[PDB]
Amino acid sequence: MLLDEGWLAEARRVPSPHYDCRPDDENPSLLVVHNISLPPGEFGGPWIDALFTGTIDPNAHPYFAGIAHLRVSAHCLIRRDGEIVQYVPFDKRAWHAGVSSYQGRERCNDFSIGIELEGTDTLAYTDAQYQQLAAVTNALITRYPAIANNMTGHCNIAPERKTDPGPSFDWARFRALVT
Ligand SMILES: C[C@H](N)C(=O)N[C@H](CCC(=O)N[C@@H](CCC[C@@H](N)C(=O)O)C(=O)O)C(=O)O
Ligand SMILES: CC(=O)N[C@H]1[C@@H]2OC[C@@H](O2)[C@@H](O)[C@@H]1O[C@@H](C)C(=O)O
Ligand SMILES: [Zn+2]
């Protein structure tokens, strides 16, 4: 698949107010794999889109009140059925990493692209998600060659704060699909 001005040519575009500029409009060089599910352990809601666009109803589930105060986003979500949703163009800074460090460099939001897999640390991701994650990643690598050398989990850049994408994320299968 192709990239069009920072947007996946093939994705549902859900443009989020939750983004700003990368410092000096630097090119991203790191892919951070995440997972997300809202409410925890459940799939298919509107809640992920709502969280990443700042419109979530704090009252729709006991879990939501707590994260309503957050200001977060990711570049893309890949749903259980493989559907790709993009909230932030890749050249812009999404708010997905939080306090983090990679190879000595902090504030990974600055130089990373965040892709969220709908799922949990302990449940297998779907065949569609691996296929689609790979297609997106291959596209990103074409545009930003350094990503080929720099793919990581949120848990690796924020250890003992974050666990996503967890043991369930099969790095071997994923890497085999990439470039
Ligand atoms: C969606 C993502 N996976 C997420 O929820 N994780 C959050 C990611 C949170 C995150 O990036 N905050 C940013 C800033 C948040 C908003 C701020 N720029 C603004 O203008 O309002 C940071 O620390 O620079 C986590 O790890 O704490
Ligand atoms: C424990 C945690 O920090 N919060 C979960 C929760 O679910 C939605 C929102 O709040 C998201 O920030 C999140 O994280 C994970 C798994 C992630 O960063 O991918
Ligand atoms: Zn994460």
**CATH code where residue 115 lies:** 3.40.80.10
Tokens, residue 175: 């890497």
Q: For residue 168, what are the domain limits?
A: 1-179
- The Cα diameter of the chain in Å comes to 43
- Experimentally, how was this structure solved? X-ray
Active site residue 116: yes
Q: How far, in Å, CA of 77 to CA of 47, rounded?
A: 12
Q: How far, in Å, CA of 114 to CA of 31, rounded?
A: 6
Q: Which of 36, 49, 72 to mutate to test the pocket of ligand 1 (most atoms within 8 A of CB)?
A: 72
* Closest alpha carbon to 157 in 117, 111, 98: 98
Q: How far, in Å, CA of 164 to CA of 36, rounded?
A: 8
Å resolution of this model?
Answer: 1.9
Whole-Å CA distances, 136 to 11, 13, 28, 47, 124: 10, 14, 14, 23, 19
Q: How far, in Å, CA of 22 to CA of 86, rounded?
A: 17
DSSP per-residue letters across 108-156: GGGTEEEEEEES-SSSPPPHHHHHHHHHHHHHHHHH-GGGGG-EEEHHH
State whether the beta carbon of 50 lies less than 6 angstroms from ligand 2.
Answer: no
| Tally of domains within the chain | 1
Cβ contact 159:100 at 8 Å: no
Q: How far, in Å, CA of 63 to CA of 147, rounded?
A: 34
Cβ contact 93:21 at 8 Å: yes
State whether the beta carbon of 118 lies less than 6 angstroms from ligand 2.
Answer: no
